[PDB]
From a paper:
The ethylene-forming enzyme (EFE) from the fungus Penicillium digitatum strain Pd1 was heterologously produced in Escherichia coli and its properties were compared to the extensively characterized bacterial enzyme from Pseudomonas savastanoi strain PK2. Both enzymes catalyze four reactions: the conversion of 2-oxoglutarate (2OG) to ethylene and CO2, oxidative decarboxylation of 2OG coupled to l-arginine (l-Arg) hydroxylation, uncoupled oxidative decarboxylation of 2OG, and the production of 3-hydroxypropionate (3-HP) from 2OG. The Pd1 EFE structure includes a double-stranded β-helix (DSBH, also known as the jellyroll or cupin fold) core, an architecture that is widely found in members of the Fe(II)/2OG-dependent oxygenases. The overall fold of Pd1 EFE is very similar to that of PK2 EFE with a Cα RMSD of 0.6 Å.
An AlphaFold model41 was used as a template for molecular replacement to solve the Pd1 EFE apoprotein crystal structure at a resolution of 3.5 Å. The Pd1 EFE crystals have a different morphology but the same space group (P212121) as the PK2 EFE. Although Pd1 EFE is predominantly a monomer in solution, the asymmetric unit contains four molecules (chains A, B, C, and D) with the overall Cα RMSD for the apoprotein structure ranging from 0.19 to 0.32 Å. We were unable to model several disordered regions of the apoprotein (chain A, residues 140-144, 237-249, 274-295; chain B, residues 139-147, 237-251, 274-294; chain C, residues 236-251, 277-295; and chain D, residues 139-150, 238-244, and 275-294). The metal-binding site of Pd1 EFE resembles what is found in most other Fe(II)/2OG-dependent oxygenases, with the metal coordinated by His251 and Asp253, that derive from the loop linking β3 and β4, along with His327 that is situated at the N-terminus of β7. Of these three regions, residues 270-290 are disordered in Chain A of the Pd1 EFE crystal structure.
Numbering used by the authors: 48 to 139, 145 to 236, 250 to 273, 296 to 407
The structure:
Amino acid sequence: STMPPNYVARVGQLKTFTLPETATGSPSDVELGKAMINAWREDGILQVSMSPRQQALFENASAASKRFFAMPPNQKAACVDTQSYAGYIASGGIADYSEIFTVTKDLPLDEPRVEAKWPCHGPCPWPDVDMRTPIQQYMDSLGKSGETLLQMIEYGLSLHPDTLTSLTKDGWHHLRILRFPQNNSHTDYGLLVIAAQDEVGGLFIRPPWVYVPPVPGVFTVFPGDIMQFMTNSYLPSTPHKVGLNTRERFAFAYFHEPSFQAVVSPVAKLYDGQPPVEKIHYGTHFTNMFMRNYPDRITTERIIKEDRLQLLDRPELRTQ
Protein backbone atom coordinates (compact mmCIF):
# COMPACT_ATOMS: atom_id res chain seq x y z
CA SER A 1 0.00 0.00 0.00
CA THR A 2 1.07 3.58 -0.75
CA MET A 3 -0.55 4.84 2.46
CA PRO A 4 1.42 7.45 4.42
CA PRO A 5 2.81 6.16 7.72
CA ASN A 6 1.22 6.61 11.16
CA TYR A 7 -2.25 6.92 9.57
CA VAL A 8 -5.16 4.50 10.06
CA ALA A 9 -7.83 4.32 7.37
CA ARG A 10 -9.74 1.82 5.24
CA VAL A 11 -8.86 1.21 1.60
CA GLY A 12 -11.55 2.53 -0.73
CA GLN A 13 -13.18 0.38 -3.42
CA LEU A 14 -14.47 3.18 -5.62
CA LYS A 15 -16.50 2.76 -8.79
CA THR A 16 -14.91 3.93 -12.04
CA PHE A 17 -16.95 5.34 -14.93
CA THR A 18 -16.34 6.81 -18.38
CA LEU A 19 -18.01 10.13 -19.15
CA PRO A 20 -19.54 10.47 -22.63
CA GLU A 21 -18.14 13.08 -25.00
CA THR A 22 -21.51 14.86 -25.19
CA ALA A 23 -24.47 14.53 -22.83
CA THR A 24 -27.57 14.25 -25.02
CA GLY A 25 -30.21 12.96 -22.59
CA SER A 26 -30.11 9.45 -24.03
CA PRO A 27 -31.16 6.48 -21.87
CA SER A 28 -27.44 5.75 -21.46
CA ASP A 29 -26.96 9.17 -19.85
CA VAL A 30 -29.90 8.72 -17.46
CA GLU A 31 -28.65 5.30 -16.35
CA LEU A 32 -25.10 6.62 -15.98
CA GLY A 33 -26.28 9.62 -13.96
CA LYS A 34 -28.29 7.50 -11.53
CA ALA A 35 -25.31 5.16 -11.06
CA MET A 36 -23.01 8.07 -10.22
CA ILE A 37 -25.48 9.44 -7.67
CA ASN A 38 -25.72 6.09 -5.87
CA ALA A 39 -21.92 5.95 -5.77
CA TRP A 40 -21.75 9.41 -4.17
CA ARG A 41 -24.42 8.51 -1.60
CA GLU A 42 -22.71 5.23 -0.61
CA ASP A 43 -18.96 5.91 -0.84
CA GLY A 44 -18.93 9.71 -1.13
CA ILE A 45 -16.47 9.68 -4.05
CA LEU A 46 -16.15 8.13 -7.51
CA GLN A 47 -13.46 7.89 -10.17
CA VAL A 48 -13.70 8.73 -13.88
CA SER A 49 -11.41 7.33 -16.56
CA MET A 50 -9.25 9.92 -18.32
CA SER A 51 -9.42 10.14 -22.08
CA PRO A 52 -6.05 9.46 -23.76
CA ARG A 53 -6.05 13.07 -24.95
CA GLN A 54 -6.68 14.21 -21.37
CA GLN A 55 -3.80 12.01 -20.19
CA ALA A 56 -1.44 13.97 -22.45
CA LEU A 57 -2.64 17.26 -20.96
CA PHE A 58 -2.21 15.88 -17.43
CA GLU A 59 1.38 14.90 -18.23
CA ASN A 60 2.14 18.34 -19.66
CA ALA A 61 0.57 20.04 -16.64
CA SER A 62 2.46 17.72 -14.28
CA ALA A 63 5.72 18.58 -16.06
CA ALA A 64 5.04 22.31 -15.76
CA SER A 65 4.26 21.80 -12.06
CA LYS A 66 7.61 20.18 -11.27
CA ARG A 67 9.43 22.81 -13.34
CA PHE A 68 7.80 25.59 -11.31
CA PHE A 69 8.55 24.05 -7.91
CA ALA A 70 12.19 23.58 -8.96
CA MET A 71 12.69 27.36 -9.14
CA PRO A 72 14.45 29.23 -6.33
CA PRO A 73 12.21 30.20 -3.39
CA ASN A 74 12.52 33.96 -3.94
CA GLN A 75 11.55 33.57 -7.60
CA LYS A 76 8.41 31.67 -6.57
CA ALA A 77 7.56 34.00 -3.67
CA ALA A 78 7.38 36.86 -6.20
CA CYS A 79 4.32 35.28 -7.87
CA VAL A 80 1.70 37.33 -6.04
CA ASP A 81 -1.00 39.64 -7.38
CA THR A 82 -2.69 42.56 -5.62
CA GLN A 83 -6.06 42.11 -7.37
CA SER A 84 -6.38 38.31 -7.61
CA TYR A 85 -5.83 35.65 -4.96
CA ALA A 86 -4.11 33.40 -7.51
CA GLY A 87 -0.38 32.85 -7.17
CA TYR A 88 2.16 31.18 -4.91
CA ILE A 89 1.50 30.49 -1.23
CA ALA A 90 4.17 28.87 0.93
CA SER A 91 4.26 27.08 4.30
CA GLY A 92 7.66 27.92 5.79
CA GLY A 93 18.33 19.78 2.92
CA ILE A 94 16.05 19.97 -0.12
CA ALA A 95 12.66 21.25 1.05
CA ASP A 96 10.22 20.79 3.92
CA TYR A 97 7.06 22.83 3.34
CA SER A 98 3.73 22.47 1.56
CA GLU A 99 3.64 24.74 -1.50
CA ILE A 100 0.52 25.76 -3.42
CA PHE A 101 0.03 27.72 -6.65
CA THR A 102 -3.59 28.76 -7.14
CA VAL A 103 -4.83 29.72 -10.61
CA THR A 104 -8.10 31.66 -10.60
CA LYS A 105 -9.73 33.29 -13.63
CA ASP A 106 -6.96 35.04 -15.55
CA LEU A 107 -8.21 38.48 -16.59
CA PRO A 108 -6.01 41.26 -18.01
CA LEU A 109 -5.67 44.69 -16.44
CA ASP A 110 -7.92 46.20 -19.15
CA GLU A 111 -10.88 43.89 -18.52
CA PRO A 112 -14.06 45.77 -17.48
CA ARG A 113 -14.38 43.70 -14.30
CA VAL A 114 -10.78 44.46 -13.30
CA GLU A 115 -11.14 48.16 -14.17
CA ALA A 116 -14.18 48.40 -11.88
CA LYS A 117 -11.94 47.04 -9.08
CA TRP A 118 -14.15 44.05 -8.33
CA PRO A 119 -12.75 41.86 -5.53
CA CYS A 120 -10.65 38.82 -6.53
CA HIS A 121 -10.68 39.94 -10.20
CA GLY A 122 -7.19 40.49 -11.59
CA PRO A 123 -4.33 39.10 -13.67
CA CYS A 124 -2.78 35.72 -12.96
CA PRO A 125 0.95 35.98 -12.07
CA TRP A 126 2.46 33.38 -14.37
CA PRO A 127 6.25 33.03 -14.04
CA ASP A 128 6.56 32.29 -17.78
CA VAL A 129 4.48 31.26 -20.77
CA ASP A 130 6.02 27.77 -20.54
CA MET A 131 3.84 27.18 -17.45
CA ARG A 132 0.80 29.19 -18.54
CA THR A 133 -0.04 27.31 -21.75
CA PRO A 134 -0.02 23.68 -20.49
CA ILE A 135 -1.85 24.51 -17.25
CA GLN A 136 -4.46 26.56 -19.11
CA GLN A 137 -5.17 23.74 -21.57
CA TYR A 138 -5.46 21.37 -18.60
CA MET A 139 -8.07 23.65 -17.02
CA ASP A 140 -9.99 23.75 -20.31
CA SER A 141 -10.16 19.95 -20.40
CA LEU A 142 -11.27 19.85 -16.76
CA GLY A 143 -13.93 22.45 -17.55
CA LYS A 144 -15.45 20.19 -20.21
CA SER A 145 -15.52 17.21 -17.84
CA GLY A 146 -16.98 19.34 -15.04
CA GLU A 147 -19.87 20.49 -17.23
CA THR A 148 -20.65 16.95 -18.40
CA LEU A 149 -20.76 15.78 -14.78
CA LEU A 150 -23.31 18.49 -13.99
CA GLN A 151 -25.44 17.31 -16.91
CA MET A 152 -25.21 13.80 -15.47
CA ILE A 153 -26.50 15.06 -12.11
CA GLU A 154 -29.48 16.79 -13.72
CA TYR A 155 -30.34 13.62 -15.66
CA GLY A 156 -29.93 11.35 -12.64
CA LEU A 157 -31.99 13.56 -10.32
CA SER A 158 -34.51 14.19 -13.14
CA LEU A 159 -34.11 17.94 -12.75
CA HIS A 160 -35.16 20.53 -15.30
CA PRO A 161 -32.56 20.97 -18.06
CA ASP A 162 -29.94 23.67 -17.46
CA THR A 163 -30.70 23.68 -13.73
CA LEU A 164 -27.03 23.31 -12.74
CA THR A 165 -25.25 24.11 -16.02
CA SER A 166 -26.81 27.60 -16.12
CA LEU A 167 -24.95 28.57 -12.93
CA THR A 168 -21.50 27.69 -14.33
CA LYS A 169 -21.85 29.93 -17.40
CA ASP A 170 -18.60 31.91 -17.14
CA GLY A 171 -18.08 30.06 -13.89
CA TRP A 172 -15.40 31.03 -11.38
CA HIS A 173 -13.39 27.89 -12.04
CA HIS A 174 -10.02 27.81 -10.26
CA LEU A 175 -7.27 25.21 -9.94
CA ARG A 176 -4.98 24.48 -6.98
CA ILE A 177 -1.55 23.07 -7.86
CA LEU A 178 -0.21 21.34 -4.75
CA ARG A 179 3.12 19.93 -3.60
CA PHE A 180 3.50 17.95 -0.37
CA PRO A 181 6.98 17.20 1.02
CA GLN A 182 8.27 14.07 2.74
CA ASN A 183 7.37 13.10 6.30
CA ASN A 184 10.96 13.54 7.54
CA SER A 185 -9.99 17.79 7.92
CA HIS A 186 -10.71 20.46 5.31
CA THR A 187 -13.87 21.35 3.40
CA ASP A 188 -14.59 22.32 -0.21
CA TYR A 189 -16.61 25.40 -1.21
CA GLY A 190 -18.03 24.32 -4.53
CA LEU A 191 -20.15 22.00 -6.63
CA LEU A 192 -17.67 19.37 -7.84
CA VAL A 193 -13.99 18.86 -6.99
CA ILE A 194 -11.94 17.03 -9.63
CA ALA A 195 -8.65 15.80 -8.16
CA ALA A 196 -5.75 14.10 -9.94
CA GLN A 197 -2.70 12.64 -8.20
CA ASP A 198 0.51 10.74 -8.90
CA GLU A 199 1.67 7.33 -7.64
CA VAL A 200 2.73 8.48 -4.16
CA GLY A 201 -0.77 9.01 -2.79
CA GLY A 202 -2.02 10.54 0.43
CA LEU A 203 -5.65 11.55 -0.12
CA PHE A 204 -8.24 10.63 2.52
CA ILE A 205 -12.02 11.09 2.40
CA ARG A 206 -14.93 10.66 4.79
CA PRO A 207 -17.93 8.60 3.57
CA PRO A 208 -21.54 9.66 4.29
CA TRP A 209 -11.51 7.89 7.29
CA VAL A 210 -10.98 6.12 3.96
CA TYR A 211 -7.73 6.15 1.98
CA VAL A 212 -7.98 6.85 -1.76
CA PRO A 213 -5.44 4.60 -3.53
CA PRO A 214 -3.64 5.97 -6.61
CA VAL A 215 -5.07 4.40 -9.77
CA PRO A 216 -3.32 5.28 -13.06
CA GLY A 217 -5.38 6.97 -15.76
CA VAL A 218 -8.30 8.24 -13.64
CA PHE A 219 -9.23 11.35 -11.67
CA THR A 220 -11.39 11.53 -8.56
CA VAL A 221 -14.61 13.55 -8.29
CA PHE A 222 -16.42 14.37 -5.04
CA PRO A 223 -19.07 17.02 -4.31
CA GLY A 224 -18.64 19.99 -2.01
CA ASP A 225 -20.68 22.29 0.22
CA ILE A 226 -22.59 24.11 -2.53
CA MET A 227 -23.80 20.77 -3.94
CA GLN A 228 -25.12 19.65 -0.55
CA PHE A 229 -26.91 22.99 -0.09
CA MET A 230 -28.77 22.78 -3.41
CA THR A 231 -29.61 19.06 -3.21
CA ASN A 232 -30.77 18.91 0.45
CA SER A 233 -27.98 16.55 1.53
CA TYR A 234 -28.77 14.23 -1.40
CA LEU A 235 -25.17 14.50 -2.62
CA PRO A 236 -23.28 15.11 0.64
CA SER A 237 -20.13 17.16 1.06
CA THR A 238 -17.11 14.87 1.38
CA PRO A 239 -14.34 16.10 3.70
CA HIS A 240 -10.76 15.47 2.61
CA LYS A 241 -7.41 15.41 4.41
CA VAL A 242 -3.88 14.89 3.08
CA GLY A 243 -1.11 12.95 4.82
CA LEU A 244 2.62 13.40 4.27
CA ASN A 245 4.29 10.36 2.70
CA THR A 246 7.92 9.23 2.51
CA ARG A 247 8.49 10.99 -0.84
CA GLU A 248 7.32 14.25 -2.38
CA ARG A 249 3.81 14.19 -3.83
CA PHE A 250 2.34 16.30 -6.64
CA ALA A 251 -1.42 16.61 -7.08
CA PHE A 252 -4.10 18.83 -8.61
CA ALA A 253 -7.37 20.19 -7.20
CA TYR A 254 -9.89 21.51 -9.73
CA PHE A 255 -13.06 23.29 -8.56
CA HIS A 256 -16.02 23.49 -10.95
CA GLU A 257 -17.82 26.53 -9.57
CA PRO A 258 -20.86 28.68 -10.39
CA SER A 259 -20.48 32.16 -11.83
CA PHE A 260 -19.09 34.83 -9.52
CA GLN A 261 -22.30 36.80 -10.10
CA ALA A 262 -24.67 33.82 -9.79
CA VAL A 263 -26.76 33.40 -6.63
CA VAL A 264 -27.46 29.74 -5.94
CA SER A 265 -30.81 28.62 -4.52
CA PRO A 266 -32.00 25.21 -3.29
CA VAL A 267 -33.86 22.92 -5.68
CA ALA A 268 -37.57 22.91 -4.86
CA LYS A 269 -37.90 19.29 -6.02
CA LEU A 270 -35.30 17.92 -3.58
CA TYR A 271 -37.02 19.65 -0.62
CA ASP A 272 -40.15 18.19 0.95
CA GLY A 273 -42.90 20.78 0.85
CA GLN A 274 -41.58 24.32 0.87
CA PRO A 275 -37.87 25.02 0.31
CA PRO A 276 -35.88 27.35 2.59
CA VAL A 277 -35.91 31.06 1.79
CA GLU A 278 -32.11 31.23 2.07
CA LYS A 279 -29.93 32.08 -0.91
CA ILE A 280 -26.14 32.02 -1.25
CA HIS A 281 -24.40 34.63 -3.39
CA TYR A 282 -21.29 32.79 -4.54
CA GLY A 283 -19.29 35.98 -5.09
CA THR A 284 -19.68 36.89 -1.42
CA HIS A 285 -19.07 33.28 -0.37
CA PHE A 286 -15.83 33.04 -2.37
CA THR A 287 -14.33 36.29 -1.06
CA ASN A 288 -15.28 35.54 2.56
CA MET A 289 -13.51 32.17 2.45
CA PHE A 290 -10.25 33.47 0.94
CA MET A 291 -10.10 36.52 3.22
CA ARG A 292 -10.26 34.16 6.21
CA ASN A 293 -7.85 31.50 4.91
CA TYR A 294 -5.24 34.02 3.68
CA PRO A 295 -5.48 37.06 6.00
CA ASP A 296 -1.87 38.29 5.81
CA ARG A 297 -1.84 38.28 2.00
CA ILE A 298 -1.41 41.53 0.09
CA THR A 299 -4.60 40.72 -1.83
CA THR A 300 -6.66 40.74 1.37
CA GLU A 301 -5.12 43.98 2.68
CA ARG A 302 -5.93 45.82 -0.55
CA ILE A 303 -9.57 44.68 -0.47
CA ILE A 304 -9.77 46.02 3.09
CA LYS A 305 -7.89 49.28 2.49
CA GLU A 306 -9.72 50.18 -0.74
CA ASP A 307 -13.02 48.90 0.78
CA ARG A 308 -13.85 46.69 -2.20
CA LEU A 309 -16.28 44.57 -0.16
CA GLN A 310 -18.98 47.22 -0.62
CA LEU A 311 -19.12 46.25 -4.31
CA LEU A 312 -20.48 42.79 -3.41
CA ASP A 313 -23.80 44.43 -2.45
CA ARG A 314 -24.30 46.17 -5.80
CA PRO A 315 -26.72 44.49 -8.24
CA GLU A 316 -24.17 44.44 -11.08
CA LEU A 317 -22.23 41.83 -9.07
CA ARG A 318 -25.36 39.69 -8.48
CA THR A 319 -26.96 39.40 -11.95
CA GLN A 320 -25.72 36.97 -14.60
